[PDB]
Design a protein around this ligand. Structure first.
Ligand SMILES: COc1ccc2c(Oc3ccc(NC(=O)c4c(C)n(CC(C)(C)O)n(-c5ccccc5)c4=O)cc3F)ccnc2c1
Ligand SMILES: COc1ccc2c(Oc3ccc(NC(=O)c4c(C)n(CC(C)(C)O)n(-c5ccccc5)c4=O)cc3F)ccnc2c1
Lengths: 278, 278
């Protein structure tokens, strides 16, 4: 029952978004074929001018009803389309339709999200593999921070993994949130750094749920008492130290993603044995 | 301590927003002179090319820190700038600065917000006057609904009043929210219609607080029990009937703003005696 009045949109903005729009001249959506946790996502195929096919995921934004939301949707499209880094999920385009919800078009990620990948017992990542995934996320966050983009929901579940095992950073979650975000409601690159530390912990435990024994409403006190996620069984000491610095109570004292890439890269090189080479 | 990196913004969007941007070649902000409830708002003066001055209000968006928020701010600017109706507050422009928070520039409204105006005992609006204010708001909402814009926070406090006593619709509030908004979290033009009915009630009581004896967390049950705001002492029966229809439990059965303008206009014409002629 979604019929959006596209004539109601502003002309200057529609002009700005043209370079992001893709349509039925290029994209086949398979509305009968679902990609099963990230909303309503369909299999799609994107053709260039000679008819070459690219497998994509096509997400239907079924909440977007009004022209404010559609205008915000267009803006998010313009922003994301500019980003170009091998560790940040690409936006292939968006669809602005007069019938049906707006669509977002992403490259197909063969191995799904990182959390489900590492939890799957049939996969056998080494400690080096898991640290490597962490380093890839750091590089993507370094790029995004360089663009002044604040992630706000960084977590293993929001990182994707392609057929070459390249981690693509993509996309309430109190157990990932910085202390200051929990109380002042505000998010920064420094709070993304805190979430990154929790993501590293997720990696080293192969997707264990963090703080299993603390209620979500008792997390602020736990953290103020100076308590932190315990060092995972497979996590080496130098990596656990990096995690602890990511959870510094003073956001200003946390390392930058640039600092993290450098440190983690040094740790990764001392490790040997990999089953998932990038 | 606000230093936003404007080079980080997208080129196509910056091009789209140019027609909304105003700068130091036209605008004098009096940062030492405050307009005292709507955030940080300063007196400003806007000059055209021959040096003619227009009194404005200049609001400093001190929350806007990151490029996502700035991009969303630009989009809101583009949308609002298109709106042109005598009962909707105009956007004179926005300021995108490399130092200091983004600014929004609005025409100065001599008589402030409608709620404070009607509560001020030194003003003497008649029943016709109050209904007239209500009709003006309805006309503004009719325009906005025609543009597919959903208000979400319609209330007497968010309507402004200029020197000619023209009401300008401008800008959590559970006692104004539709039943369905309270439970499904979603907002529509039909939920704006519900808030409009509460605004009419505010008008007819000269800014009394609604549902004085019900806690904000008991409002959903109160409404589900079929209870409604009582008919104000000065509210005529036909207007109270309009209010009741605005609070129909079925959003689809509520009148349109177009229907409201027509009905309220008929009621207003049967009234005589005014101190605030539009
Ligand atoms: C094989 O299993 C899967 C499972 C899910 C897959 C998959 O899921 C998604 C993964 C990510 C996303 N979307 C995002 O990451 C989005 C991002 C980062 N943005 C931008 C922003 C963060 C600013 O909102 N948006 C977005 C973009 C434009 C308009 C609106 C939202 C998005 O939709 C949407 C998805 F459907 C993509 C590709 N392959 C997959 C493969
Ligand atoms: C004499 O006393 C006063 C007191 C307040 C006054 C006054 O207060 C304001 C009244 C309204 C507003 N702002 C709005 O109504 C805004 C609206 C409707 N928008 C658009 C939207 C609803 C989509 O957010 N915005 C807005 C616009 C551009 C960018 C960001 C937000 C706004 O700032 C800002 C104000 F400072 C304006 C003029 N005269 C006044 C006079």
């Amino acid at each position: 029952t979604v019929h959006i009045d596209l004539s109601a949109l502003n002309p200057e903005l529609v002009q700005a978004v043209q370079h992001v729009v893709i349509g039925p001249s290029s994209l086949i959506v398979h509305f009968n074929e679902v990609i099963g946790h990230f909303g309503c996502v369909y299999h799609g195929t994107l053709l260039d001018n000679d008819g070459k096919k690219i497998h994509c995921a096509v997400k239907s934004l079924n909440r977007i009803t009004d022209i404010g939301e559609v205008s915000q949707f267009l803006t998010e499209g313009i922003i994301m389309k500019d980003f170009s880094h091998p560790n940040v999920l690409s936006l292939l385009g968006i669809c602005l339709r007069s019938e049906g919800s707006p669509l977002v078009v992403l490259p197909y990620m063969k191995h799904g999200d990182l959390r489900n990948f590492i939890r799957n017992e049939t996969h056998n990542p080494t400690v080096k593999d898991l640290i490597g995934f962490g380093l890839q996320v750091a590089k993507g966050m370094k790029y995004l921070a360089s663009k002044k983009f604040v992630h706000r929901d960084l977590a293993a579940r929001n990182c994707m993994l392609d057929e070459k095992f390249t981690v693509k950073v993509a996309d309430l979650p109190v157990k990932w949130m910085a202390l200051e975000s929990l109380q002042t409601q505000k998010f920064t690159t420094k709070s993304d750094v805190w979430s990154f530390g929790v993501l590293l912990w997720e990696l080293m435990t192969r997707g264990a749920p963090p703080y299993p024994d603390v209620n979500t409403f008792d997390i602020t006190v736990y953290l103020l008492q100076g308590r932190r996620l315990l060092q995972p069984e497979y996590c080496p000491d130098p990596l656990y130290e990096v995690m602890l610095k990511c959870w510094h109570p003073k956001a200003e004292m946390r390392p930058s993603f640039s600092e993290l890439v450098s440190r983690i890269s040094a740790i990764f090189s001392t490790f040997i044995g990999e089953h998932y080479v990038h």
